[PDB]
Design a protein around this motif. Sequence first.
Motif, PDB file in Angstrom:
ATOM      1  N   UNK A   1      78.979  31.248 106.967  1.00  8.06           N
ATOM      2  CA  UNK A   1      79.383  30.605 108.210  1.00  8.06           C
ATOM      3  C   UNK A   1      78.657  31.247 109.358  1.00  8.06           C
ATOM      4  N   UNK A   2      78.356  30.469 110.387  1.00  7.83           N
ATOM      5  CA  UNK A   2      77.642  30.989 111.544  1.00  7.83           C
ATOM      6  C   UNK A   2      78.349  30.586 112.844  1.00  7.83           C
ATOM      7  N   UNK A   3      78.003  31.275 113.943  1.00  7.41           N
ATOM      8  CA  UNK A   3      78.484  31.014 115.303  1.00  7.41           C
ATOM      9  C   UNK A   3      77.466  30.164 116.072  1.00  7.41           C
ATOM     10  N   UNK A   4      77.889  29.496 117.146  1.00  7.85           N
ATOM     11  CA  UNK A   4      76.890  28.813 117.972  1.00  7.85           C
ATOM     12  C   UNK A   4      75.766  29.775 118.326  1.00  7.85           C
ATOM     13  N   UNK A   5      76.109  30.993 118.709  1.00  6.86           N
ATOM     14  CA  UNK A   5      75.087  31.976 119.030  1.00  6.86           C
ATOM     15  C   UNK A   5      74.509  32.635 117.788  1.00  6.86           C
ATOM     16  N   UNK A   6      73.793  31.861 116.966  1.00  2.56           N
ATOM     17  CA  UNK A   6      73.383  32.327 115.642  1.00  2.56           C
ATOM     18  C   UNK A   6      72.161  31.565 115.096  1.00  2.56           C
ATOM     19  N   UNK A   7      71.726  31.944 113.880  1.00  3.42           N
ATOM     20  CA  UNK A   7      70.588  31.325 113.193  1.00  3.42           C
ATOM     21  C   UNK A   7      70.907  31.042 111.714  1.00  3.42           C
ATOM     22  N   UNK A   8      70.459  29.894 111.193  1.00  6.06           N
ATOM     23  CA  UNK A   8      70.748  29.483 109.815  1.00  6.06           C
ATOM     24  C   UNK A   8      69.519  29.608 108.946  1.00  6.06           C
ATOM     25  N   UNK A   9      69.649  30.310 107.832  1.00  7.51           N
ATOM     26  CA  UNK A   9      68.555  30.374 106.881  1.00  7.51           C
ATOM     27  C   UNK A   9      69.016  29.949 105.507  1.00  7.51           C
ATOM     28  N   UNK A  10      68.281  29.040 104.896  1.00  6.01           N
ATOM     29  CA  UNK A  10      68.564  28.613 103.542  1.00  6.01           C
ATOM     30  C   UNK A  10      67.403  29.011 102.647  1.00  6.01           C
ATOM     31  N   UNK A  11      67.700  29.500 101.445  1.00  4.92           N
ATOM     32  CA  UNK A  11      66.647  29.900 100.523  1.00  4.92           C
ATOM     33  C   UNK A  11      66.706  29.207  99.161  1.00  4.92           C
ATOM     34  N   UNK A  12      65.520  28.970  98.602  1.00  9.99           N
ATOM     35  CA  UNK A  12      65.301  28.325  97.312  1.00  9.99           C
ATOM     36  C   UNK A  12      64.422  29.225  96.453  1.00  9.99           C
ATOM     37  N   UNK A  13      64.640  29.268  95.145  1.00  9.40           N
ATOM     38  CA  UNK A  13      63.716  30.016  94.301  1.00  9.40           C
ATOM     39  C   UNK A  13      62.374  29.309  94.253  1.00  9.40           C
ATOM     40  N   UNK A  14      61.277  30.047  94.151  1.00  9.61           N
ATOM     41  CA  UNK A  14      59.962  29.412  94.223  1.00  9.61           C
ATOM     42  C   UNK A  14      59.626  28.497  93.054  1.00  9.61           C
ATOM     43  N   UNK A  15      58.890  27.439  93.369  1.00 11.08           N
ATOM     44  CA  UNK A  15      58.317  26.529  92.397  1.00 11.08           C
ATOM     45  C   UNK A  15      56.812  26.573  92.531  1.00 11.08           C
ATOM     46  N   UNK A  16      56.113  26.374  91.428  1.00 12.56           N
ATOM     47  CA  UNK A  16      54.664  26.370  91.436  1.00 12.56           C
ATOM     48  C   UNK A  16      54.159  25.101  90.797  1.00 12.56           C
ATOM     49  N   UNK A  17      52.881  24.843  90.999  1.00 12.59           N
ATOM     50  CA  UNK A  17      52.230  23.656  90.487  1.00 12.59           C
ATOM     51  C   UNK A  17      51.025  23.399  91.366  1.00 12.59           C
ATOM     52  N   UNK A  18      50.336  22.283  91.120  1.00 12.83           N
ATOM     53  CA  UNK A  18      49.181  21.971  91.955  1.00 12.83           C
ATOM     54  C   UNK A  18      49.628  21.727  93.378  1.00 12.83           C
ATOM     55  N   UNK A  19      50.690  20.951  93.532  1.00  8.18           N
ATOM     56  CA  UNK A  19      51.260  20.678  94.838  1.00  8.18           C
ATOM     57  C   UNK A  19      52.789  20.672  94.796  1.00  8.18           C
ATOM     58  N   UNK A  20      53.412  21.414  95.708  1.00  6.41           N
ATOM     59  CA  UNK A  20      54.863  21.520  95.719  1.00  6.41           C
ATOM     60  C   UNK A  20      55.402  21.167  97.082  1.00  6.41           C
ATOM     61  N   UNK A  21      56.296  20.191  97.133  1.00  6.81           N
ATOM     62  CA  UNK A  21      56.911  19.796  98.390  1.00  6.81           C
ATOM     63  C   UNK A  21      58.421  19.946  98.371  1.00  6.81           C
ATOM     64  N   UNK A  22      58.935  20.640  99.358  1.00  7.43           N
ATOM     65  CA  UNK A  22      60.359  20.831  99.490  1.00  7.43           C
ATOM     66  C   UNK A  22      60.837  19.865 100.546  1.00  7.43           C
TER      67      UNK A  22
END
Lengths: 166, 166
Positions: free
Chosen positions: A79-100
């Motif tokens: 949970x975050x406050x208005x006076x805050x920053x949100x970070x979301x993380x994903x485990x890495x994927x590889x390949x010729x081209x990867x789009x999140x």
Amino acid sequence: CSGDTIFLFANATANIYNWTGPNGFVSNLENPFIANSAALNAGSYTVSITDANGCSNSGIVQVAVDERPVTPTITGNGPVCEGDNIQLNIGSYTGTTVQYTWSTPTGVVTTGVPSLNINNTTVADSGLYSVVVAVDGCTSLADSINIVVRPNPIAPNVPSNFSVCE
Amino acid sequence: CSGDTIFLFANATANIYNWTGPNGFVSNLENPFIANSAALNAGSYTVSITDANGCSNSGIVQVAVDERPVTPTITGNGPVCEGDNIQLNIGSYTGTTVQYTWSTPTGVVTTGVPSLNINNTTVADSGLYSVVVAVDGCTSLADSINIVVRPNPIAPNVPSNFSVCE
């Protein structure tokens, strides 16, 4: 893409069809299929056709099976406050081209990096976030996370200006 | 789905049956079966039939073995208060289509996400929860968790309004 059904086509008539493939695949059907496709069935498939006059010919189809990325787990920062920053993380994927590709409460954004960063978070950012990952053409099933961002509290009441005597 | 018994059918009469399959499978039975099916038996099975006049014909059946997801372990958030929220988590499953079906003390809900979230928990939510996961048609055995949610305590007695002298 892996797990789905391979549909082969002869694209020709025959009285008798004969298919041969990579794992001892054998079929006498026009346009046969392979269920639950997996990489060990990728390869060269041979089509052999015998016509009404007893004469025959053939051809080759190269069948690819693309690798299916695994659904990511979105990891948030709580949970975050208005006076805050949100970070979301994903485990890495590889390949010729990867789009999140990310869906947020305020719209859709994309990145080549397995992360999302909202600086100067506001209450308008409350809601569900989700990510789908596409690797070389195969799209994973998306994950969803609930991010909660609440407003900063209002300055408290303090007694108004006053005076006392020594 | 994997682990069960494959039942093959000739769907034809014969005096003599001859089956051939992927791992050196051989049978002379009408409609034979393979116990403890596993992916290495998936593939093309050939049926060869010899009739009373000594003449013969054949055909092919493509046999799939679907992958069986492993029973998930439900991870809860411990005992909760009426003034609280319940979150249950499952390890992710992948496939073409994944459905998480949850049984709760108040009914049955579904999701595409390996989680369950009850906000504004109430004592009516006390009881067993269970989850079964279905991946591309195979259903895992469900897991069960006991979630305990108790009522908030009653405001304590405090002496009634009174007065003292300096």
